[model samples]
Target: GIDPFTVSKGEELFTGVVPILVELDGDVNGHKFSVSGEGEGDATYGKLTLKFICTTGKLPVPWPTLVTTLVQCFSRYPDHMKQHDFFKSAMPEGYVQERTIFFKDDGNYKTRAEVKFEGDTLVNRIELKGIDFKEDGNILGHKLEYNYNSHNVYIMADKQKNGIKVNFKIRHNIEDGSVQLADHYQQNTPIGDGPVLLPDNHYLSYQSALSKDPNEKRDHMVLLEFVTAAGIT
Candidate 1:
């Protein structure tokens, strides 16, 4: 005879996130802003995104312009009919240099990355570097790249098998936030453990528990909640 109070220790898939940095450079109205941010999220599936917030606390992108504003002869939001600050079409493209941490199947294959920028006319650039797994491990040296304007992510993979080959995968319409977190939580993998700060920046995660034998006592389906013994809010 057992009940819902039975506790279990879940698999330690991940413990904590490592602090990562994103460095960005852009010009607006003859003003140049080189900004950086402290970002850490679900660094899984070999993808990560760190949102660099400016004092502006917003985004300046998709630098499209409306040259026909003068011919419209009407008022809109810039006034929508005119070229306003939103129209950065005349300005040069911005750049981003980012470093993020990632791991595979439980962080056993920890990896670090560096975004390399080049090309006087080239815009966004990203490169893979450092940690447990490196690009060198992949045939043809796989890479990770992104776009400043669209924030798109491109994953270059290596087969390195019987028939050695490389693969390129692209994800569209991504935002400046955590990448592939949906897959993480959806799979219901272990939430991880450790001392890194949470996304909220207010509360830090420290403790976790899981029913030792999820299917043993017939209590595996029990729902439960917990407050850390340290009470460190």
Candidate 2:
């Protein structure tokens, strides 16, 4: 009952529309660079594997130097390492390095890092080990376990229309997972002031947009007055 061809086509179309390098920023020396890419893969059950190839350039320094500078920049934060070089000692010769820049006891987190360059691009993968929480002094764990992979590609482009574009896709196995929860792919665009964009018009399932309520209306003069006073509308 599954369609591998359709999934493949959807992956191609989605990658074409969004492109991976859409989130890059900053200047190297005095030159600027951008990123883009395409992704492809397969999805079945609950396990997914995706790949991306993005590109960017105009970097004034070599990849390692740029990474070092970024690490130094994070030193100003309180209770954090002054530079990533210190932590680099703990990792193997070629392992990609990341640092937890900020975190709260309540589970919120923020991080930054530099990945190893493969050929001419900085590449890395994110592994979601699953969610964990503690209650009554006991630890509870759930295994949404599956292998997921992604790659960041960098390239040089002379203009907005010439940047690198990423191509990506996923293959999943959902034996013990809810089909409804596993039905959709999780796509995220980088957060920043640049022109990064996502596939905003794609539909994931049959009832994706069936809940529109544009025709519903209510007469609430008092509630509206309160909302207006509170600047909520």
Candidate 3:
């Protein structure tokens, strides 16, 4: 019989660590913002942790205007719109209106937004001039790229076997979070051991594009996921 909770010697376990870094760069009204993220994972127990840093310096636009642009960028994602009620044509403007609530103006001049993983906890901070804005408890979970904006399917397999299809879903457990994988095998077979993160090379992506006068088209979000994790040996 195989023991599920305890790690044993000669158990065919993974010892190598996978490092993840996602960096992003974009510009709005000549004001550029760079966002980067680093992830930590457990090779033995299988847990994933992430931290993000976003910087937007003094821009010529107002607080709401700047935030409006940020919201619009994500609004362009098809999945994002579908999740919000399938409001296709009016989705962009409608979603923007909703996000405007969290970014309420304090008559400030500059703003910075960041999310960090500290001591197994996710910490969020948004600052403007002298006042610190409390983060929206619900919104952070919604905007995480891998958590909300990506595909739900994941394939797992060994070097000589066919792939098994599994589903990846984000689970919010109290103040902590984990990525849950389900095979739904034997209905009563537990869903997972503990939740694991970065099981395989995957993507967390969003897209933004605009068309000008039917002849010009351009993109604003230029971000990519690089897998630094070497193949398991």
Give the number of the best model, judged by TM-score. Answer: 3
All candidates' TM-scores? 0.22, 0.19, 0.22
What C-alpha lDDT do the candidate models reach, one value each? 0.21, 0.20, 0.26
Candidates in descending lDDT order: 3, 1, 2
Clashes of 3: 0
How big is the positional error of residue 33 in model 3, measured in Å on the Cα after superposition?
2.5
Q: Measured by C-alpha RMSD in angstroms, how accurate is candidate 2?
A: 23.4
145-233: candidate 1 lDDT, tens digit per residue = 12222211211211121111111111212333432111110000011221111111111111111122344332111111111111123
Query: What is the Cα-based TM-score of model 3?
Result: 0.22
Predicted model with the maximum lDDT? 3
**Candidate 3 clashing pairs?**
none
Task: Tell me the deviation in Å of residue 32 in model 1.
Answer: 2.0
RMSD of each: 25.8, 23.4, 20.7
Q: Write the per-residue lDDT of candidate 3 for residues 103-220, one digit (tens) a residue.
A: 2222212333332222232222333332223233222223222222222222232222211222233221222353322111100011123211212432222221211133313212
Q: What stretches of model 3 exceed 4 Å from their correct place?
A: 1-14, 27-32, 57-151, 154-233
Candidate 1 vs candidate 3: which has greater TM-score?
3
How well does model 1 score by local distance difference test?
0.21
Model 2 lDDT vs. the true structure?
A: 0.20
What is the number of backbone collisions in each predicted candidate, taken in the order shown? Answer: 9, 40, 0
- Cα deviation at 44, candidate 2, in Å, is 18
